[PDB]
Ligand binder design. Sequence first.
Ligand code: HEM
Ligand SMILES: CC(C)C1=CCC2=C(CC[C@H]3C(C)(C)CCC[C@]23C)C1
Length: 466
Amino acid sequence: LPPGPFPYPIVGNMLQLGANPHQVFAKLSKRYGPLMSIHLGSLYTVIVSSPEMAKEILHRHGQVFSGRTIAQAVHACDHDKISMGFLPVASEWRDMRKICKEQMFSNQSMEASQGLRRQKLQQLLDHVQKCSDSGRAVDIREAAFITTLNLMSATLFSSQATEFDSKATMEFKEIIEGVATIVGVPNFADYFPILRPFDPQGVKRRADVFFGKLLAKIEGYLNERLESKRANPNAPKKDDFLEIVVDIIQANEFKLKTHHFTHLMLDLFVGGSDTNTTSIEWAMSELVMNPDKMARLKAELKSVAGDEKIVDESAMPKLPYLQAVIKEVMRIHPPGPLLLPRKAESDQEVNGYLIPKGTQILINAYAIGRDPSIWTDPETFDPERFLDNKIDFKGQDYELLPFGSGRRVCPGMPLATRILHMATATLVHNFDWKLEDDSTAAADHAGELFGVAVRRAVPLRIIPIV
Ligand code: HEM
Ligand SMILES: CC(C)C1=CCC2=C(CC[C@H]3C(C)(C)CCC[C@]23C)C1
């Protein structure tokens, strides 16, 4: 087996992991190497912490390591048996992946939804404008959370709401926060198989309530769309994912049930919410703490957009520094520092070590992104490192893997980048920013809180001015 720290009886290595396990794993792998055995109680795991080992796992043996480890929380409303996120690579997963690649996240579909997202960006602009008149600090975590939910809801459901914090949006927010509280804590049933039948912390029960809330809303949206399409055959076709769902269902070309689609929408909606929310916050935090970089991005946006307030997504090719800024946030602050787990579908040898069937595989993208043997000055925020650099986060550069790579690489990347780039551009272009209070500024920026997505323990509070 790969080398690693001595595992104690019963608990394995679990007692050493602390509040930020990805940081502990990063330091451990400096000692034990880029393939490292960790015993999460009885859940045997191997940590991957090199670009070289990530390529061996995700690409050379990408089919063997194509499975997922499935947390007990994921069994809520039998999501584990329906979900593109957790099914094994097989016909049903392949069909759902094809639907996302060729129809939902196509260039054609992303361009068609650009206007839906533009109005949500305008709503964000207006909201921040009021705080700026008042002189009030903006809580960037909450602003990014609402904006991301609004942008996701627009793209997936064409949600209407003229208010920034609409009641539909705030119900989504309640649900997403609830899922994060549940999953964001250790479920001992995940680590001790004798406890699974018992659900001793009620994690799966509590997850059922939130998953059910979300599926109920999605099923309602789907049924409403089906009825309005039936009643209004001549109305223009909407440019959202729900329209695509409906057409695919009624064309009946896929061996997929209705719940595959509702659960896919669930997966996509939750998929883009904490991830973009924390990333937007980190982007603003890095820029506020590195005023030279804030100035350089402002200068680019001024040059390209000038007096326009809302950048078109179509303009992204003209904004290389904005792209470099987001790459650099992804390098330092991958929202999931250990990505989503993979699983060995069979015994496999890697670098002379046996990786047994069923091993949980965690890619420590965070460690790789901060490894000094790979990145110069790894702890410094330096977007310029990506200018005229062909390294990207699409999965082909194993130094930068915030979205994974190989078989299960994030299918929502096309939408995520549009959200990240535009939310950042809107905030940076239209206001200057100061910390509400800079007395513990460095500590506020460094302090991470682990969870579904790793985020600043202290929410960023900054005052907008013009
Ligand atoms: C915003 C930043 C985002 C990051 C950093 C991110 C990252 C990731 C990562 C690391 C994975 C696992 C990849 C692997 O197994 O190799 C993943 C999977 C996934 N992501 Fe994302 N993601 C983001 C946004 C989104 C968005 C916007 C959506 C939906 C629109 C989404 C939907 C998914 C889904 C459904 C999967 C599961 C795919 C599968 O297992 O086949 N993500 N993401
Ligand atoms: C984008 C990446 C990080 C992501 C992680 C968690 C989520 C993904 C999409 C779907 C979603 C559920 C199926 C609702 C289960 C909890 C986490 C997970 C799998 C996608």
